[PDB]
Structures are given as structure tokens and as C-alpha cells.
Design a protein around this ligand. Sequence first.
Ligand SMILES: O=S([O-])[O-]
Ligand SMILES: O=S([O-])[O-]
Ligand SMILES: [Cl-]
Ligand SMILES: [Cl-]
Ligand SMILES: [Cl-]
Ligand SMILES: [Cl-]
Length: 416
Amino acid sequence: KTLEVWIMPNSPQPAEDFKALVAPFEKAHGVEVKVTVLDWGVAWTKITTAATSGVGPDLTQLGTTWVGAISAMGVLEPVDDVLEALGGEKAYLPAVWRTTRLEGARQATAVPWFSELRAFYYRTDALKAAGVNPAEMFASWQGFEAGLARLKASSFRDPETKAPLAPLCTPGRTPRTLHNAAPWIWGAGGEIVRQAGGRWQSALNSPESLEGLYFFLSLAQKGYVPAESLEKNTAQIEADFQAGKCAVFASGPWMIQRAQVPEAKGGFAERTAAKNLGVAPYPAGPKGRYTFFGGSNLALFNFSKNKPLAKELLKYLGGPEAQVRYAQMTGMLPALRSAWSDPSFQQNPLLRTFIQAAQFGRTYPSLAGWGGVENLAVQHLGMAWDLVAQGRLTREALKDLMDKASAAINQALRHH
Ligand SMILES: O=S([O-])[O-]
Ligand SMILES: O=S([O-])[O-]
Ligand SMILES: [Cl-]
Ligand SMILES: [Cl-]
Ligand SMILES: [Cl-]
Ligand SMILES: [Cl-]
């Protein structure tokens, strides 16, 4: 009677890392845990097929934004008991607690596993050369844009590339998520959706959502993001920062680990970027400072024949030791807030800065139809990036694109 867990590729050797993570559990319970790794490309279909058919694992990883949809299909075992065992609501950042259930539900259907959050990496050497104070640049929108202007004008050249750096790298081609836009929307006082007028509705066409989205998108149109960045994807921009092409770029905590180890093990300790690496939280907008939170949770299918032992494994994976260990393996932040005290975070100044950024964490409402909302939002955000690529984004053009986004989202939110 052996547990079956489904995971996605969260670490360099996903199945073996997971098996090393649960070795102490296996010993204590006299059990083997079986793991299957699902590519992110097919994980959603595999998990919805398990949901509809009843053919699946005991435990599955879920992206945080998936919890509403799978919970609303009726297939997840309540895990309030597990979360209470881990410390209950105060054991988590509120944005992370929000991901434990369908929005508005009283019963928890998912256990927080690990957190993606995003902050700005910068080249300490580039900002020093351009006369930019990092505290000022990453404090506010005005500091941020003034910084990028100084970096655009800087005579500084990367030691290894012998070329100027792009002030900001951000991808403009084929956006799959709102995660790079959301902090700007939120900082302006906006949101992606809201409860207004008795309904969930798009808030992308609100003046405040448009202010934040225009502020961000216009940086690229002012020459702070080179056309070559605009043209690209998400591991390219990490490769670009590593390769000394970008002064500033947003990423998660995994780049810190990578900066600390040589090319041998898949790091960039050798590159000028590793030796001149800073991190700062997103700047405050006019209506607040917000950090995007994502990541993954664990869930138990209620058709499992080993729910008792599966709940023990959720307690283990969700708990302090496994939280610290799996954060190291994945390069993510623990979902269990107590684990942030661990020396592995507190002895690394760049990881302490991520924990500073964590205090401002926010995430999307846990809606059953969240995926439809985000798919329509990203499609229209990509239309906006396309106007940037032509230098044709105006405030009126962005407003028109988000009014079309909002009609489509509102229609999708009226259907289940
Ligand atoms: O329903 S609203 O998009 O007119
Ligand atoms: O616009 S109707 O399809 O909800
Ligand atoms: Cl939140
Ligand atoms: Cl974006
Ligand atoms: Cl939102
Ligand atoms: Cl304009």
C-alpha cells in the first residue's frame, strides 16, 4: 500500500531530490513513497484528467493559482487538520494562506509547499558607475525611472562583454503570466479582478490599473528595455543577466544559489554579474508596495485509498525540516513562514532581502475560473507589448486593449 505523489520539475533532479527529501519520512513510517514527475507543459491536463476520472496519485503538486479550479471540481480532501498541525493561519504569510482554498471557502484543500516571489536583481558595479544609489532607485516609481535614465546614459561597459548594459531586461514576447505586470498594477492602487457591484469583474481597465500598467510598459518604449529584450522569453533573460547584458532584471531567489556556484554545477560564480550582485524589493507605487507571490501547494485527492498516511506526508512536507531542505533544493522561499529564520536564509544578505520583499507579498484571488481570467489578461497584455515593439503604445491604446480584456474576462466570469 504505497503512496503515489505527482510533482513538477521544481529542482535540478526532480524525482531524486524529492526522494532524498522524503527519506526521513520513509524511514519513520516503514514505507516507500513513489514519485512521478509531470512536465509543466502537460501537468494541468494530467491533473484535471485524474480529477474527472478518479485515476491518479494520492498527493499532487498544484500551482497556487490552480487550487480554486481543482477544489471547485469536488475532488480534494479537506486539510484543515494538517494546516492546524502546522500552526494554522498565523504560520503563513496572508498571501500564502489565501492559496489554501477556493476563494471564500471555509475548508482548506491545499497545503502550502513553497513560494515563488519576485524582486529586482541589479549589477552593483553598473549602478555605482552610473551614480545611482540602490536604496533610492528601488524605493519608489520616481527613483526607479530616474535610475534607469542614469543607467541608459552611463559610459559603463561590462568587463567581459566590453559592451554597455541594458538598463532593464523584461520579456515582451508571448507573456504567459501576469507576474511581471501585477506589482505595477497593485502599486498604482489597481488589481486584475475585484469584487465590485455584486460580482467578480476585471479591474484591468480601472484608471489605477491602467496607470500602473502604462508606467511599466512605457519604460520599454522610452529605451530602458532594448528591442532585443522585448523580442524574448524568460530563461533567455536570466541567461542575458548572467552574460552581462542587463543592469536590472526581476527574478526569484533561485538566481542567488546559481551565482554562488561555478559553471561546473550549472552556476555563474565566474561571471562579473555573480561578483557584483544586488537584490532589492519592487519599488513602492503611489498606493503601496507589493511583491508577487506564486509557487506550488500539495493536495490530497479524496478518491485516495491512503488518506491517513497521505495526510502524515503533507504534515511532513509542510513542516520545518522539509521546508528548509526543499527551499534549498528548489531555490524558492519556504511556504512555512517559521522556516525563514533558518541560517540558510538569515546568513545570506540577498536571501534576507527576499524575506524583506516577502513582507509585501500579494497574490491573485483564488477563483475557480482564475486560469481563464489570466489567459485572457495575458493575451491582451501581449497585444500591449506588441504596440510597444512598434513604439505605438499610448494611454488610449492601452485603455482600449484593457476594455476588450475586461469584456472578455467579465463574460468568462459569468460562465462556469
Ligand atoms: O459585462 S461588462 O463587460 O459589460
Ligand atoms: O456575455 S454573456 O455571454 O455572459
Ligand atoms: Cl493576497
Ligand atoms: Cl509583462
Ligand atoms: Cl488581483
Ligand atoms: Cl499617451
